[PDB]
Structure formats: C-alpha cells, structure tokens
Symmetry: C2
Subunit: 91 residues, 2 copies
C-alpha cells in the first residue's frame, strides 16, 4: 500500500509532465514562428537598406553638382564685378 | 568697348549657370523626396522587426518558466521512482 500511494502519485505526476510538455510545444511553436517572422523582417529591412543607401548616394551626387555650379557662378560673378568696376570708371 | 563685349559674355554665362542650377535643384528635390520615402519605410520595417523580436523574447521567457516547472516535476518523478523501486 506504500507502493499503493506511489503508483498514484506517479500517475498524477506523469500527467502533470505531459500537460507541461503540451504547453511547451505550443510555446516552442510560437517561438519558432516569431523567429521566422523576425528573420523575414530583417531580410526585408536589408534589401531596403540597400535601396535607401542608393538613394542617399544619388541625392548626395546631385548636391555636389549644385555646389559646383554655385562655385562656377561665383567665379563668373567675380569677373563680372571686376568688369563692372572697369565700366564704371569710364564714367 | 571690349568691356561691353566682356560684360555681355559674362552676364550670359551667369544666365546659363542659373538655368542649370534650376534644373539641378528640381532633380535634387525629387531625390530628397525618394530618400525620405525610403527612410520612412525603413522606420516602419524597424518597428515591425521590433514587434517580432519582443514577441520572441517574451515567448522565450515563457518557455524558460515552463522548463523550470518541468524540471521540478521530473525531480518528483525520479524521487517517486527511487522509492518505488526500493519496493
């Protein structure tokens, strides 16, 4: 009967562990799925990053283009102001 | 009066540079727009990655708490098996 209580505890105990195994399997499933979604999102973000960098680069190139045009303008304006002074003296 | 010819040339030169500048600026505006759109998208994606990650971490904590309970049960089962076996 000692082994009588035992046999009962084992029964309830093995049931507990099976219930716990069931819960673990649900949680592990949802965990793996969350990791997959994560990885999918990271891959999307990388591809995007690639495109974003390209955009940044294009914009930056255009920017250097404008600054070069601005410098030229200022070189011309320097010459222009000189010639303007020279014209004004004639008067 | 070579000054007048110089003046005409320089002024026209400036007109040409101004035009070019206007065109480049319109291209620049478009480029800025595209860049900002891409950045905004990246922010959304970042937010969604974060959601997934936090789900994952949470799920993970759950798993560990469950594992601790299982370890406990396991220990009871072994103790009750050692008693058992001893007849």
């Amino acid at each position: 009967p000692e082994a009588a209580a035992l046999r009962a505890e084992l029964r309830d105990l093995e049931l507990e562990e099976a219930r716990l195994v069931q819960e673990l399997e649900d949680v592990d499933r949802n965990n793996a799925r969350a990791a997959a979604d994560l990885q999918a999102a990271q891959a999307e973000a990388a591809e995007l990053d690639q495109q974003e960098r390209q955009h940044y680069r294009d914009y930056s190139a255009l920017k250097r283009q404008q600054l070069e045009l601005l410098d030229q303008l200022g070189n011309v304006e320097n010459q222009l102001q000189y010639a303007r002074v020279q014209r004004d003296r004639l008067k």
